[PDB]
Design a protein around this nucleic acid. Structure first.
Ligand SMILES: *[C@@H]1O[C@H](CO)[C@@H](O[C@@H]2O[C@H](CO)[C@@H](O)[C@H](O)[C@H]2NC(C)=O)[C@H](O)[C@H]1NC(C)=O
Ligand SMILES: *[C@@H]1O[C@H](CO)[C@@H](O)[C@H](O)[C@H]1NC(C)=O
Ligand SMILES: *[C@@H]1O[C@H](CO)[C@@H](O)[C@H](O)[C@H]1NC(C)=O
Ligand SMILES: *[C@@H]1O[C@H](CO)[C@@H](O)[C@H](O)[C@H]1NC(C)=O
Ligand SMILES: *[C@@H]1O[C@H](CO)[C@@H](O)[C@H](O)[C@H]1NC(C)=O
Ligand SMILES: *[C@@H]1O[C@H](CO)[C@@H](O)[C@H](O)[C@H]1NC(C)=O
Ligand SMILES: *[C@@H]1O[C@H](CO)[C@@H](O)[C@H](O)[C@H]1NC(C)=O
Ligand SMILES: *[C@@H]1O[C@H](CO)[C@@H](O)[C@H](O)[C@H]1NC(C)=O
Length: 750
DNA sequence: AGGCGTTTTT
DNA sequence: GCGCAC
């Protein structure tokens, strides 16, 4: 029988998802559907312009309703089409259980009547230009009001949004208010004392005083950034902050003892008034980005009081048209004993020395340090030795060049104890000297440099704890036999996109160093265009995973018997990616020379038009096989052979016209199968023997199915619907006539 | 007339 | 197949 909520899709935790179905009105759903197991209803980005009383009446246990992007104002319409949305006055009253509503990106000019149950209301990017107490009548349970972007460059109005004095006082539970991008010039008078988060960024509130935040002693977060902007850093349309502005009175934040988060970004500040931070001893996050505090951070004592502060953002506090030769942080940074995260990216300074970060050197909790995009050309990396609790340094996108004068295939550094990112720098060789005091390092990123060195075993000698080394997007010449052997703990090495040496026609290269890395588990030689004149075998007893994608095994395996055993010496290998290797053909003899230990084999985006399925028995441990993106015209020439351990099979984006009967039958372990984007005109239960019920995923979307009245496929997909993703909307007909390009349920086939 | 379309959400 | 060395 049918999916219960056609054309929408029943998802977990009682969600009915009608997203992106181009609906003109809300679907009703027959009484046969369990409309009370329905706890949430999503109608994102349809084209419903008219909302009725009956539309939600029958969904009597509905808690969440998303109606976003259905009727976008002209400025947000991708083609500037106007749209007004009519709501019948009992539309939402008929859902007395409603808790969260999203009416954002919809042309409405007044708030509709809403049930008292409502805990959350989002009215952002609407055309509502006024809020007064009649707007939000009887919403005493309401805790969240979000109404950003009702008057700005993308949704203009010609005036300020008008929140009348005391308009929201009726809302006794209101903790979260947001009114960003509304062209406000003053804070709204008399907001509920219950407010905990108040967000007024990207308005034009140029003056503040303690009157402007009267009675808001519950505030835990206050965002007032972007009201007086520096447009030299603006990516969007921007009005430059007037001269003699902004004016923030000293004691503006004095009565906010509970304040945890203060955002003052992009406020054109040349000087921090320390009186701003008096009485803010409970402050944990302070954002001062995109201001002009480049001098003030070498001098100020305004941080002295902030004992509990954890995150400090000083990024893009850069002087117009200049980078500094030197930057020395203030002594008062040394009293931030709680500090975990410091962002100094985009200040622009040329030198990083002991003096630069001296005050931070004895802070016990300092873990993450962002110094990227600073045009730094000299860096004494040895300063980080004495930092007690450091876990992460981002020094990427700098001009440092030396010492001073898919998680299956490559693991991330996220859970390691000490990571240095030096990517997007100007190293052309690696000097041991620059790492002299970094023997604690577990992860080093040096990608997107200009390293064009024949590494030999002498470059990374100090790094005796290093487990991950990323050298992707460089020009390494792999030639000497002992490259990387100075790293006793190396488990993951990325040498991808170092293609240029391998392009050098008539000059060969040496991969025999892989045998000399006894602890290595992960290796990417991906996107190197390896095609000729290389070692005939990779040899390693430790290696579990090898990305060899983006090379030309094609040309290698065409070259007599030289490279037929290339991957055979990888005795423990469990994952191999041979994708985009230009393979037009495979011998069964080539596949059997891959390691017996293999569990995962990718051959994506090759040019294979034929695959001898019987040779899968030569890889007895194979659980996953990816042939996506090849040119198979059929699943045939044998079946999946007996006793095969295969669980995941992807033959998507081929040109498969048919499947032989009983093709999958002997693959009893098969759980996930992707037949998407092929030329299948039908889906038969006879492909699966009659053991298809074990399948957890069967993707048959984007296939030119023959939707002839009474077709055998229709019935089959309903018997295994739990396993077919997107069945209600995305499995479509290629024929006949007017059904082409429309869902299989666009007319009843039975 | 309405169309357009996967466009952070906080 | 990239200063080794009948
Ligand atoms: C089955 O394969 C298809 C097509 O190869 C997958 O659809 C692609 O999904 C990726 C991300 O997973 C997207 O970047 C592409 O845009 C999609 N391509 C097409 C042509 O639709 C699909 O996700 C796979 N199904 C499952 C269940 O994993
Ligand atoms: C907050 O709403 C709840 C209903 O969920 C109610 O108990 C309480 O009266 C409300 N508080 C105020 C101050 O209105
Ligand atoms: C913002 O406010 C003023 C009202 O004085 C108006 O002139 C201006 O056009 C408004 N801006 C936008 C983007 O609507
Ligand atoms: C602040 O609170 C006092 C005491 O309850 C009240 O009388 C006063 O009107 C309030 N001020 C504002 C601006 O809401
Ligand atoms: C590596 O090459 C350097 C030149 O940079 C040379 O001095 C050194 O002896 C070689 N080291 C090893 C371990 O082969
Ligand atoms: C490749 O490197 C190994 C390890 O030093 C070396 O023995 C072998 O001779 C090299 N191959 C060539 C062709 O130079
Ligand atoms: C697959 O290879 C085997 C072993 O060499 C061979 O017997 C068989 O004919 C091949 N299958 C097809 C369909 O050509
Ligand atoms: C393989 O099957 C295809 C598709 O039906 C067929 O055209 C071809 O002749 C078959 N070849 C072998 C060797 O089985």
């Amino acid at each position: 029988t049918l999916p219960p909520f056609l054309p929408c899709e029943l998802q977990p935790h009682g969600l009915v998802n009608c997203n992106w179905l181009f609906l003109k009105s809300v679907p009703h759903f027959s009484a046969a559907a369990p409309r009370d197991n329905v706890t949430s209803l999503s109608l994102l980005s349809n084209r419903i312009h008219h909302l009725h009383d009956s539309d939600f009446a029958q969904l009597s246990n509905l808690q969440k309703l998303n109606l976003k992007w259905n009727c976008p104002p002209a400025g947000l319409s991708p083609m500037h089409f106007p749209c007004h949305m009519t709501i019948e006055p009992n539309t939402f009253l008929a859902v007395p259980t409603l808790e969260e509503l999203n009416l954002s990106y919809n042309g409405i000019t007044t708030v509709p009547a809403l049930p008292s149950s409502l805990v959350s209301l989002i009215l952002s990017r609407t055309n509502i230009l006024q809020l007064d107490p009649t707007s939000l009548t009887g919403l005493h349970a309401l805790r969240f009001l979000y109404m950003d972007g009702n008057c700005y460059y993308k949704n203009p109005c010609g005036r300020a949004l008008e929140v009348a004095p005391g308009a929201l006082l009726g809302l006794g539970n209101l903790t979260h208010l947001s009114l960003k991008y509304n062209n406000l010039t003053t804070v709204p008078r008399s907001l509920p004392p219950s407010l905990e988060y108040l967000l007024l960024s990207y308005n034009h509130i140029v003056t503040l005083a303690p009157e402007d935040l009267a009675n808001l002693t519950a505030l835990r977060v206050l965002d007032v950034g972007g009201n007086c902007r520096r447009c030299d850093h603006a990516r969007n349309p921007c009005v430059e902050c007037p001269h003699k502005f902004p004016q923030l009175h000293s004691d503006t934040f004095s009565h906010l003892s509970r304040l945890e988060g203060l955002v003052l970004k992009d406020s054109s500040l040349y000087q921090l008034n320390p009186r701003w931070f008096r009485g803010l001893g409970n402050l944990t996050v302070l954002d001062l980005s995109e201001n002009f505090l480049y001098d003030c951070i070498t001098k100020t004592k305004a941080f002295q009081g902030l004992a509990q502060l954890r995150r400090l953002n000083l990024s893009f506090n850069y002087h117009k048209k200049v980078s500094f030769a030197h930057l020395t942080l203030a002594p008062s940074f040394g009293s931030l004993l709680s500090l975990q995260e410091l962002d100094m990216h985009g200040i622009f300074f040329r030198s990083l020395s002991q003096k630069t970060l001296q005050p931070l050197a004895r802070l016990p909790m300092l873990q993450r340090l962002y110094l990227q995009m600073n045009f730094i050309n000299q860096a004494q990396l040895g300063i980080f030795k004495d930092f007690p609790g450091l876990r992460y340094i981002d020094l990427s996108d700098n001009r440092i060049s030396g010492a001073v004068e898919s998680e299956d295939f490559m693991p991330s550094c996220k859970n390691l104890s000490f990571t240095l990112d030096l990517s997007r720098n100007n190293l052309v060789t690696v000097q041991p000297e620059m790492f002299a005091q970094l023997s604690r390092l577990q992860c080093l990123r040096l990608s997107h440099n200009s390293i064009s060195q024949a590494v030999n075993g002498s470059q990374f000698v100090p790094l005796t704890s290093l487990q991950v080394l990323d050298l992707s997007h460089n020009k390494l010449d792999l030639y000497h036999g002992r490259s990387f052997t100075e790293l006793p703990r190396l488990e993951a090495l990325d040498l991808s996109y170092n293609s240029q040496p391998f392009s050098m026609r008539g000059v060969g290269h040496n991969l025999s160093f892989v045998a000399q890395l006894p602890t290595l588990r992960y290796l990417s030689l991906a996107h190197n265009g390896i095609h000729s004149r290389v070692s005939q075998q990779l040899c390693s007893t430790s290696l579990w995973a090898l990305d060899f994608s983006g090379n030309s095994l094609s040309q290698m395996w065409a070259e007599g018997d030289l490279y037929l055993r290339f991957f055979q010496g990888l005795r423990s290998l469990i994952r191999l990616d041979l994708s985009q290797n230009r393979l037009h053909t495979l011998l069964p003899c080539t596949l059997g020379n891959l390691p017996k230990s293999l569990q995962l084999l990718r051959l994506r985006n090759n040019y294979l038009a034929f695959f001898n399925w019987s040779s899968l028995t030569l890889l007895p441990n194979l659980e996953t096989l990816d042939l996506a993106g090849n040119q198979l015209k059929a699943l045939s020439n044998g079946s999946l052979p007996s006793g095969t351990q295969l669980q995941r099979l992807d033959v998507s984006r081929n040109s498969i016209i048919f499947v032989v009967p009983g093709f999958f039958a002997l693959a009893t372990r098969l759980r996930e199968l992707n037949l998407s984007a092929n030329a299948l005109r039908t889906v038969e239960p006879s492909w699966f023997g009659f053991l298809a019920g074990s399948l957890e995923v069967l993707d048959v979307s984007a296939n030119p199915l023959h939707c002839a009245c009474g077709a055998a496929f229709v019935d089959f997909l309903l018997q295994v619907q739990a396993a077919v993703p997107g069945l209600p909307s995305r499995v479509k007909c290629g024929s006949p006539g007017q059904l082409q390009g429309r869902s299989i349920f666009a007319q009843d086939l039975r």
